[model samples]
Target: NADFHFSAIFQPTDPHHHQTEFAKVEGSEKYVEEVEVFGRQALKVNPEALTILAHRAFSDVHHFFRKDHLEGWRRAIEDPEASDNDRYVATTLLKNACIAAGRVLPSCQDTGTAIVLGKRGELCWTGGEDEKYLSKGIWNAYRYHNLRYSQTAALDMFKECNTGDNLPAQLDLLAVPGSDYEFLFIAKGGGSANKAYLYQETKALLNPKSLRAFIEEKLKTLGTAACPPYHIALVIGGTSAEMTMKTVKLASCRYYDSLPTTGDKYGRAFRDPEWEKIVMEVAQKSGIGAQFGGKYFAHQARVIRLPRHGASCPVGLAVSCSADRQILAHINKSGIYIEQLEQNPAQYLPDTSVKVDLKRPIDKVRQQLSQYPVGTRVMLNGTLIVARDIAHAKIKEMMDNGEPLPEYMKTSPIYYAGPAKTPEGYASGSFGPTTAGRMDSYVDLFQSHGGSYITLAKGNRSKQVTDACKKHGGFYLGSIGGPAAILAKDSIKQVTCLAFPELGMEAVWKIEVEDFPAFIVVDDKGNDMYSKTLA
Candidate 1:
């Protein structure tokens, strides 16, 4: 029999992703001490350091972004071949970064589920309650900041409620070598989280031709829902389906950027740069760009190939959205250090958009919109009735009980959105559009009931939505998916809850907007801007 030899599936030379920069946490050194345990060097960490680091990391990630992420936006603007819509969206996002840098409002409205991937070194000592300390840090971030609480808890099979505090966080802790604790923190928004996908394939898909075609097919399906230009990740195989998914998520965050470029005889995971380039090409050509139609569908792509079981080939696909929030950190004897994101995002900023006044009658607004094509950009001003998932369901229930469609849904454009916690003096919080497709099932019914004639939100809708708009002489406007801080500071003039206060952010609200930006995505003429790329 052959001698036994153990090998790790991942043996990256630079396991810490050192190509990126990191900064020491000021005054954090006091929370850690070097010690001798059983004739070995060890580091004793105070649990309080976990909370402090977590809080700072989460808060900082919301307002700042990694240098690569900022550079991608600049690339979209500076690229000569990029569509006008692409440049417009990139500029808006960069400006939103500037506003977010002020630390008053977050970059996006959906603050996301708190996720912590922690690897504890064998000799690193902290109390056993790591989850509690880490969660407290996450809790402090959402509780003290202007972020939104997006986590919902299940009361029963069909009943649910928001967790108010955005907890408990998804904590995945592992034991590793050394006396240091490393972490990858992510605030994964629902939009991008819902976009993560898994597929099982056979040996036939291992060929180049099939793989390329498969990628193109699936890339198009991502559509514009998750607020592209996306950081796309594709994992070819894994020991199991869950491993494939976990690897893809980390790849999307660039956590595996340092993985070797080629696989080995030992079946270690490695990144396939050639295939990554192929994915990038497909994304550029997809024309699904940003939120509206353009050439910058994805900012970049990661292709990681891993070892697989003989009978299992699990392929995973995921994306990090415009609000690409993640932070890498490690704790050592000296102190806790965090990845240094771009604080002066304005340095990447380069300097539109049609104007549409919504203060007019609903019929007049429809007539004005009818003149434009599906991709025409418009700046909306005046009133908007805001409601999302729960509010819509409740409205439908009321109508089923013989109530009218409610004049609020008919008078002004229905803005599918929810606001984050408002700061002390702001007119609104970091308010932005949610994924519109979730509300697609109700569009036709509500329009038939004499409301939702003109609805506004992000992402492409289904064929039913196109048919409904054409039948009811209505429109579906596509708002720029990210850049909530800028919209809140510059556009939203007033806000007030109109109904369903018990539902929290899902409540119906009426708001006044000035110079709000959106594109005509679905027109009354049965046209959709995403017909070619997303349909």
Candidate 2:
């Protein structure tokens, strides 16, 4: 006879809080009250507190970073074994953080999708329209602040438009066992969001050797697209695909750091510190360091083991990239409180870079870049034509309609980027490169048409880019993946809408830049910096 046993999948002992520092929101006491109902203690919360918390969480996350996140960057910089590229990227990101702490410009150009994981206690009372209030707060952050609108809406099967205000946040609100509300607000960018992956496996893959090998294989597929030294998470098993994906995401945020270290027969979720170490080793050994190359491919790793159906193993992998934007908060009768992120990023904060002038002719620029090897670092000064996904697609459509590649596309180096709102007295916004791999499909075609012969963006591209460059005497430059604020404040001198203004941030723009940093990822001589690790 089977005995009745109860087991919760997650039984975090740190139910009250994590090892985090939090500051109470000033004047928030007015938003709550103590109440008694049905012989029980309760808290009556003003619905407006939801908006206030959400707004503060989203806005603050963009400008500041968690202490642990900052420490990782410092570690990379101070580590004697860290490659020069690793220290360079880490130092640049730290400087960017200092600029962002000013609170005028955000840390990155892609301000990200707002995600709120809210848990309301049974006795906590607020108006049921939590999503509305939360969305209003998110909208306020994007609108009133210098953030980007990243949400796109589908009108039909193919037609789409940006939501404009970055509204309709991902709100996962749950009713749990109290008289208070808790939340985890995340500003998740497209690059990192796109890197989340899921895999279906079987019991045969559960052996230690097989599992370790599996991790080694899958982690390489992540490459450099999402930026690094990444905070990576790996979930070994889950009840379902979505659950595994969710677990991996939370793990990347370090939200599950308090999970039990060992599992029980009752199917509780647990973390495996040993496997986490193995993952760190694998990442360090991979040599796909912070964007360019070296040993700091990952700052840390989280390996979570969850019970699953005997016949199936649902594995999930995800990462929190260099931006590392997220915040935790809670509200009670005392008032509202939010996680305190590091404000003085300068405390966490080097290298010689070749100067390449872009003001010269396109061929001359290509010749200068050709003189360097794949991993050579360079500082760019001059003009850049900015464009991203939609612009590329529209231009391809025009070419399909018998128009030649636009003259502007042929003139300057193409910088794959988008910018946040321009603040007052600023020449440009928080402008930075987007993922370059997204445009690999257009490279050969564009180069054949006499444009995009030299491209600049983040992340390692597919083999097609290398082939295209070899065939067309092209070059693909890798920008420092993060550090948009410094790039905007220090590098970009002017911005102009050159074409396709209707595309919004995806519009074709021309910008003047000085000391824009990049590395030669792919060269005309059939060479790629990532050929060894990311290959």
Candidate 3:
């Protein structure tokens, strides 16, 4: 039971597709009933079956993360070696987990691209319009869920516009020989979705003498920007580059967890659990813990090995962000089944009382920040002006017009965030930080203009940011990512628009924050946490 719907749009190939013989078992009496249509043997299924389920599943994934993912983050704190910085990050995330238990805004700001992997039965007939029903499911999900619409279509290559409903999903459906259709539904955010990489390498590097080290080299490039404690998926070899990348996607989602550990006599693909452990250890030791300085960089690493041609050994790497949103569904006469997500994620919430005094100094000019060291623990209170991609560009334009950078930006820390819709009786939606690296280019210039002296956001920063901080005596505080709901519910007290109100979430806003926890990313000195590690 597989489906082959995505003929082109985001083609993701599966290396382990094979035909299975129909079998019968007792008490499994209705295991897979066969049906016929138009004089051909087929399975009679309501096309809307996948639709209604996909719609509901898509909406659920946005608000509720998987139980296993929540638990993994919870366990991050149980590690005694976890640094205060990492532990604090974990605590905030666990708290956010509780807040996201509400059916309002999603856990992450970026709602993500829709993905549907359908396994159609060998003899199935929905009058051949299954794609429409599936697409319709995706539409209803984003349109009504208060989820952010992320997909942009090329109106004319250079011109583009948001589809407004997050459509044109990467649907990969293949035909499987059975009467029951199965599927995997994923709501993949752009932050993590953009991390997919495929490397076309030579066969000379296949051997251990060269392969082992090369593997770690590629893994290093996966920075904290994708929001790890990740589910790291590595694909070693494939018949083609595309195949390798698809396998990486599958392995990252635990779709290949059932594969044998050893290659089959027929040369089927497999996973080496021992080597997976080694790779996972290597990633955790990199000190890119959930985007801060600590040991929770990756929750787990999956290594999938597929047979390749003699001349090619393509390596593909991908990650499921800390958001880690994906689930499964199946449809048959028995009724449509969707993956069970964490219904009460708040129970997994840990004790957030880390109980350590953090010395936060927000005044007295450069002297205050100058005292704090890179990787120092700090809590922020008072005002922060939030600006992200669109607002940054508009500010650049204003700077070009000889307009001085706003005083609020100069006096308060600039938070790199763009919030979702404001819920009724709320200051902001599940508010959280966006990737700081995207705003790096504007840093030096803004600081040169006497604004943005102290910056705050998540993940790592680029060299330009470090240089800007050193030159301007600025400090960049790294907030805990993947904890938007918690930050919005507890820390942010008020939100008001400062500029570009018409830009919606992309507008500039002034927010009053209280006890906003963050780690010192870049110090007034030349020290930077990101500068110390490759990620």
Candidate 4:
């Protein structure tokens, strides 16, 4: 007989059981249909459609950044002589994050551990068919979905998996005498989750300046690893560990229904408003600059309050990165759930008969690219090869070994992509540019070996790489990040990579793109469009 002691007031939800439940919900035909519809719609859209779609996509991403930005803006806007540059920088950072979200295949590849927090009196399961089914469903989703695993080195013996679809939920079950179960599922990503912190101070010790300074120091140390353009959720009360933890979670989950204005609901302080003001001031002034561009800095800071003991005030901080992937749902007693997932309305762009004249010299193409802004979109009809991180790494290794280079590199653009494949059709997954920064170290290798125009998103390159691009008559271009579905549709032809079918997303893929859209970031003249934009 196993001795099992369940708390009288609370019960823990088993991972296996939760997995089963999650699987049931996600694997349902309705779920599958919704996902397919969204995916298809995303791919079939044109540039015009994408612009319209950008709103929903941007809003979804902004929901996470805006809350913090609003708080920060509110505090700074009060400064009598603040310039529009201050506001513009903050706004532009949000826009850039949205742009990054739009261009990337996956908004956040490392969706952190999933958490399900339910309030008391919420009936998650009735201990009958529903309960049994739910448990089984969750397990199925976890095993079959595209979840990623994070590895730990020898110092930390424990190995943890991220469960790619963000599953194996951390459920907080509270008992209430009700038939309906309300579940708040938060799919946090690693960038923000990595920033979670706690600080303890005695009643006799703390001052406003010290607290503000501490937060500023933390921001400086965290850098962009925690992912800037972040939404910092602070829990500024509570005394016990349990209370502090709960408070932090609650604050993180708090969704402001309306924009924070002077007379808005948020003006009523639940926490120390003065402290929050100071923190926001320090953060925005921290001068870290935008995560992708050095255009703006910290967006905002928000704090929530909890009941505290007389002797102590426990503070907890949880950050939401710019990607900000989350979904909200409402469930009724009949087991019906209504999800208010952000949906971008589809708009169709009129088919353009514009044709790319490949006979035009590369210099002419470069001149045309130079005329447009860094973020401008231009379609190319020239040939391009799809290369990703792994292939590049292998190429670097081969070059180091003094191996002969591939002959085709002399005259083609190498695109950084790792597309997904499906049975219905090939190149099924979202195909977007990976981080350009990752390939910075390999720029010299590629340029020396005759590689030309490199296409990527979120440009952050070293001076050496820029110089290499200039020396070799090579160029760099930016692709819209999250618009893979659109980019995949533009593929008039596919070229097979010479190696690694097993690598999947990291596998080398040679593709011939027709009228494929991209924007030049660095030209052959050692002129960087990004640099020009800042100037």
Candidate 5:
């Protein structure tokens, strides 16, 4: 804050965090003298500081979680009233957290789209290419860490290539009139990225009756694709579409928790705490708690209503996945300081003696799967052949060329996943299920050809999936969506590349499992757990 000027430092504050307070002083108190060697520039901010902050932000978020966030997972496990499914999933997540704390494997496989939001003051001096510096830090984090290469260059409609290193991050650097520089870095995954949406609407539908029904449906139907126990930011208005989305992201991150609870003619944002609670109830009552059936669908929801244009209502929805990778940082005369994150997550884990074991015979477990009615919770134990988006396409390619389906894939249930790099001492990197729906297109074709008779992954599938299950006597198990670290560290065993080793993380592999926990989402009888919820 050493480079901060009174007029230069201004951002819209949040209305209902109920946290810290920093009031704006009137007229003369807000002005400051021009102190400098030559012109009005007063402070020197090193270019390297943004780079350091960027690296620190990326590293911290990857290795740690907010203690409160770990507490949320802890509460899910410790809440005696929670469903058995919810507690089991929460426990898995906590174990993943404990393992991830070792700093070897990241918490999730999709390392993410690196994003840096910054505010540079006029009087503050850096290399002026803070984004360039920040880009280097992002490159450093992904290059040195066990992260996945997620960004693909869309150079043309037909020609696309993985940018190799996740570069060209979304850098929005704003210059404020202040002498201080503040920054926020985020690792946004594809699953969570898909959940962000802006619904343009007219003013007439803002009436309570229409509004409630519309939002209830919108929130409910957003579904379990992105890992849940989500932090939701519901924005009702915006001066522009981009501003609304920016507010939604910050609110969901809880970055503006220090914001004041009032707005003025200068234009600020506020949330309706009372109505926030009402909608929070609606999210819970949707009966899609934590990823399966239960009460805690959302960890919390914040309503940030902004000043809008007269005719347009840009109702924005943004959610932070359970991964929740974001951090705040500031550079000052004292030095650079990033927000501290929870490093020792092991304390949140349950007692070792109380741990449940799921080591069942493979044959017995497969037989038991048949008896699992829709929504039944069970401990999965067996061998699973893994494939994801690219893997599936590769298999279809082989078959298209008249090659037989790989024998290993025919017998073992296929778990649709793409994983991060395997750490030196670990069996695999933070590995979790990808969206089930992506592979749904291949289900009917796969089942017809003797593969994919039994599949496992996260999220709801289409009607064709249920119909395929009925036609093929197949089963689709819903793996806990988040908690990739735990799945890789604890449950996954004996990972061997069965085919397509060249696909990097998307390779087809064989994994022997002990007791993995999952829910019978779709069964052979054509029953579906989530379809009715949508209805």
Candidate 6:
């Protein structure tokens, strides 16, 4: 029965390819036209829709803090208890914290490890092909659709590891007796998983104070590395691995259902209202601020209690970042499944109406760019080259060997995008900027070789990179984070990859964008608007 259910859940479907084509328009022309149109449209639409969803998801798990948390931050900021300089420093810290965690970006860049838990019925599998189907489906969804991956590399190893479609999917398949199979798919991002903690105890009686103390200690040590504005789930029962893993997976399902009812048996409840109040107060009061640097800190905390063994009290803490990109599906006896997932049309604006012209001047464009805010959407119109880590690495290698750089660098801005190639009509699929910080080391290579500007998302960079942009008249801009479909709308024109076609998204292609909109983060004077505004 379990096997049968698993097989049904993992059935392979036709591969879905969502790539687009780039038109052969001049980069300059397309740049000006598309950016203006797209950027204005984005600004007009309410960005709060996505922001509200993220905030509510955080609140549902009790991970969202109250005004008291802000009060603690306020005290630190106004700390008549501290010096003027201290207050300024603390307030600045708090401000940055909110900006980092509270922003409507994909909760965190290192969207963490993937975990899969399958409960199947024994003597039910249809030829035991369920596991393969499930594995392949997950891989395709992530690699081709989700597009989330870890960027960190272990310094000791010196080799970057792609978690194999972000795999080793923490699988736990159990046999049940039901003829029907049900599957629960949860994608846990890294920010929360990084903060997961486990503790063992020999005594069954676990006091609240002791648990609180342990949590506080862990949080202090974890700091902002785990990314704040997280959903914390505490599992108090079951075997160690089972309880911890199940609790974490369950926490990811927080946003799947409707708001919790106080009377529902399995509904979320405020445990120890007084304790919850105290813990929240302490968390926000700790001055850890939002994204670890802001004024206000912990958003909320949820506590789930279960019966444990007479000789054991085990607590598992699972955190989910503010983005909360998790969903749940229910399968019935007919092999039909129903799911309620987050869908933001504003985030994935359609490209049916987009238009672009590809010849324009850089200076004229800068004058126009100054009018928009940071998140303004723009369609790019101009000749643009798509490049990323692999292509960049090769470029760096060529430069190191004292070879002439590619001719396209002259008078063209290289986009740091990993776009998928589409069919005849479009040039790429869901094209958006990759993290530009990854290219910081090679800043000089591009600038010296005649690169004009760089565009990407998640404004991470060093002072040197900013300085280089200032000295060389180069600029750094950012696209909307985590909204590839919306960004792809501007690529109304198409071009092909001239090199490294096997790299797929990382291939080097020439694209012409129309009025593609992006905000200038690092200006020519080394004035980084992102850092200055704590953006």
Q: Compare candidates 2 and 4 on TM-score and give the better one.
A: 2
TM-score of each: 0.98, 0.98, 0.86, 0.53, 0.87, 0.52
Angstrom error at residue 18, model 1: 2.5
lDDT tens digits, residue span 1-535, model 4: 4775432211223311222222122222221111124233111111222122212222233223323333443433334434443343334333333333343323333334544554323332333333223334344433333222222123245432222332344556566553334445465654466567777856543566666666666655444444455566676556476666665654554443221222222222254456567666665565444442432335555565544567777777776654455433323322223234322211110112224333355556555554544434456686666665667777777878988666555445667665533213534333445556567788777777656445444434556767887787666775543334445544435556646654544656666667665556666667665453223
Give the Cα error of residue 132 in candidate 5, in Å.
2.4
Question: Each candidate: what lDDT?
Answer: 0.93, 0.93, 0.75, 0.47, 0.76, 0.46
- RMSD (CA, Å), each prediction: 1.3, 1.3, 6.1, 12.6, 6.3, 16.9
**Candidates 5 and 6: which is better by lDDT?**
5
Please give the range of 10 consecutive residues that has the lowest summed lDDT in model 1.
Answer: 349-358
At residue 183, candidate 4 shows an lDDT of: 49
TM-score of candidate 6 versus the correct structure, residues matched by position: 0.52
Clashing pairs in 1: none
Please identify model 6 stretches exceeding 4 Å from their true place.
1-116, 122-127, 136-180, 186-326, 330-334, 342-380, 421-424, 532-535
- Candidate 3 has what TM-score? 0.86
- List, residue by residue over 1-535, the lDDT tens digit for candidate 3: 3753322212123423222111121222243345676676666666776677678878878777776688777778778877666666677777676677687767877777889888887776556777888899899987776566667678796655556677888889898776677778888877787789988888888787687787667767788788778888888888799889888998888777767777654557788797789778777777766677678888888898788788888988899987788877666655566666777876765543211222233345356657767776666667788998767887898889998877766766789987766667887777788888888999999989888877888777788888888898887888777787778878888899988876666678888887777778888878888776674
- Model 1 clash number: 0
lDDT of 5 by residue, 72-162 (tens): 8888888876777667667777787777787888888888899888878877777588888889888888888887777777869845566
Q: Relative to the unseen true structure, what is the Cα RMSD of model 5?
A: 6.3
User: Which ranges in model 5 have alpha carbons more than 4 Å from their true place?
Assistant: 1-41, 78-81, 260-267, 349-368, 394-408
- Sort by lDDT, best first: 2, 1, 5, 3, 4, 6
Clashing pairs in 5: 3-179, 4-179, 5-179, 8-177, 8-178, 15-261, 96-486, 121-178
User: Which parts of model 4 have CA positions greater than 4 angstroms off?
Assistant: 1-182, 186-324, 329-333, 336-338, 342-377, 405-411, 421-428, 462-464, 489-498, 525-535
lDDT of 4: 0.47
Candidate 2 lands at a TM-score of: 0.98
